[PDB]
Every structure is written in structure tokens, then in C-alpha cells.
Amino acid sequence: IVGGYTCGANTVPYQVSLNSGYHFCGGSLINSQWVVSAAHCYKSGIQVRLGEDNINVVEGNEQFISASKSIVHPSYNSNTLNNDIMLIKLKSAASLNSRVASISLPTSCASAGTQCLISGWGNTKSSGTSYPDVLKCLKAPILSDSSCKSAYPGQITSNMFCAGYLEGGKDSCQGDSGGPVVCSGKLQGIVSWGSGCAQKNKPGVYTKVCNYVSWIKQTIASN
Ligand SMILES: NC(=[NH2+])c1cc2c(I)cccc2s1
Numbered sequence: 504i505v506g507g508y509t510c511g512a513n514t515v516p517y518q519v520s521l522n523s524g525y526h527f528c529g530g531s532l533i534n535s536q537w538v539v540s541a542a543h544c545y546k547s548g549i550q551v552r553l554g555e556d557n558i559n560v561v562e563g564n565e566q567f568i569s570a571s572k573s574i575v576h577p578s579y580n581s582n583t584l585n586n587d588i589m590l591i592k593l594k595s596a597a598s599l600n601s602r603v604a605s606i607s608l609p610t611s612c613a614s615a616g617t618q619c620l621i622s623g624w625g626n627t628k629s630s631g632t633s634y635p636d637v638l639k640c641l642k643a644p645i646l647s648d649s650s651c652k653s654a655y656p657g658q659i660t661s662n663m664f665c666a667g668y669l670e671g672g673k674d675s676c677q678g679d680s681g682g683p684v685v686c687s688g689k690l691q692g693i694v695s696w697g698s699g700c701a702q703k704n705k706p707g708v709y710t711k712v713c714n715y716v717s718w719i720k721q722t723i724a725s726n
């Protein structure tokens with residue numbers, strides 16, 4: 504996250520870190536046994552870490568659970584990143600408490616202008632590499648599809664939306680992939696892609712979760 508701030512330990516209780524020997528993507532806990540993240544974060548051998556704040560230090564509120572299975576969306580296209588969402592089932596059901604909570608799925612899509620909260624342990628420099636050990640947060644509004652489409656002509660589908668600042672400066676970045684974009688208490692997006700980080704006229708692009716709620720609900724009830 505570039506131009507964001509330290510969240511504070513366990514203030515984003517639904518945030519997850521996917522680890523395959525190191526942190527590689529973020530994710531969201533939607534219920535005791537399931538996590539949603541980005542399909543481009545797909546890896547075999549994932550361990551989900553809940554109640555994290557500093558990922559290099561065991562502070563006492565963590566739960567490390569291995570995934571029993573991963574389901575990438577049936578129509579995910581790794582070339583355009585269209586339908587960049589994946590569900591991960593845990594081997595054991597997590598113990599929810601004040602530091603580990605699930606986020607709710609949306610009932611409808613959000614409007615351009617709605618302010619959202621984006622969080623993750625990704626890179627914090629636009630030009631450079633600086634990886635934080637504590638969670639970073641960023642408040643950013645959803646942008647209109649027109650400004651999203653003009654920034655990225657022929658690359659935006661109806662399953663993607665942009666959020667951020669066209670002037671640059673604040674944005675999600677690599678290492679944040681799979682993480683949550685929560686607006687009004689609902690998980691509305693997943694960190695998917697962008698052209699560099701915090702660049703001017705290059706906002707972040709997020710998976711539009713409101714379009715996958717039936718697929719998520721149907722898939723988790725059958726697995
Ligand atoms: N501009 C952005 N918000 C992003 C940039 C990236 C990059 I570069 C890699 C992976 C994910 C993301 S999100």
C-alpha cells in the first residue's frame with residue numbers, strides 16, 4: 504500500500520496473509536472455513552494466517568491453518584485477469600473472536616464515490632521496493648467506470664472497477680493482491696492489478712465481488 508497508514512493491530516480482523524514459506528498475497532475471511540482471494544495468487548501449498556499484524560513476529564493472536572482445497576473461478580483468464588477471484592477452504596474452522604472476524608458479502612454493488620478501506624502488507628514505494636511488516640490501510644473511493652476505462656482502454660470488463668486517486672500518490676501495489684476493499688461493511692473488491700503503483704492516471708483495478716455472490720454461496724455450500 505503506498506501513501507496509506509498503519510492500521511493498528513487487529514483493526515481489520517477479516518484480513519488474511521497467504522503464506523507458502525513467506526507472505527505472497529492477502530485474502531478475506533468470509534466465514535470460519537472459507538477465504539476469498541485473487542485467482543492470480545493461486546499456489547499449491549498455502550497456509551492461511553489469521554490475526555496477523557506484524558507478519559515476521561508471533562505476537563500471540565494468530566491462527567495458522569492449511570488450506571484443504573482452492574477453487575479458482577471457472578472463467579478466470581490469466582491473460583486479462585478477468586474473473587480474478589479464488590476461494591480457499593481451511594482444513595479446520597478458524598476460531599472467530601475480536602481479532603479474527605469474517606466480512607460480509609454485498610447485497611448490491613457500490614456506487615462510484617463510495618469510500619472504501621484497502622489493506623495489505625504490500626510494497627509501500629511507487630518507484631522502489633519497501634515491504635512493511637505491519638498492515639497498512641488506505642481509504643480510497645470507487646471511481647466512475649468512465650475514468651477507469653479511459654486509463655485502461657480495452658482492458659476493463661464488467662467484473663472490474665477502479666478505486667483510488669487519478670492524481671496518484673495513494674494506491675494498493677504488489678504484495679497487496681488478493682486483499683480486501685471493504686465499503687459500507689461489505690467486501691466489494693479484491694486487489695487485482697494496476698499499471699505500477701500510485702502513478703498518475705493509473706488507479707488500481709479490483710475484482711467486482713458483487714457479481715460473484717451467487718457463485719461464492721453455491722460453491723461453498725457444495726464443498
Ligand atoms: N496499481 C496497483 N494498485 C497495483 C499494482 C500491482 C502490481 I505492479 C502487481 C500486483 C498487484 C498490483 S495492484
Ligand SMILES: [Ca+2]
Nearest residue numbers: 557558560561
Ligand atoms: Ca505475527
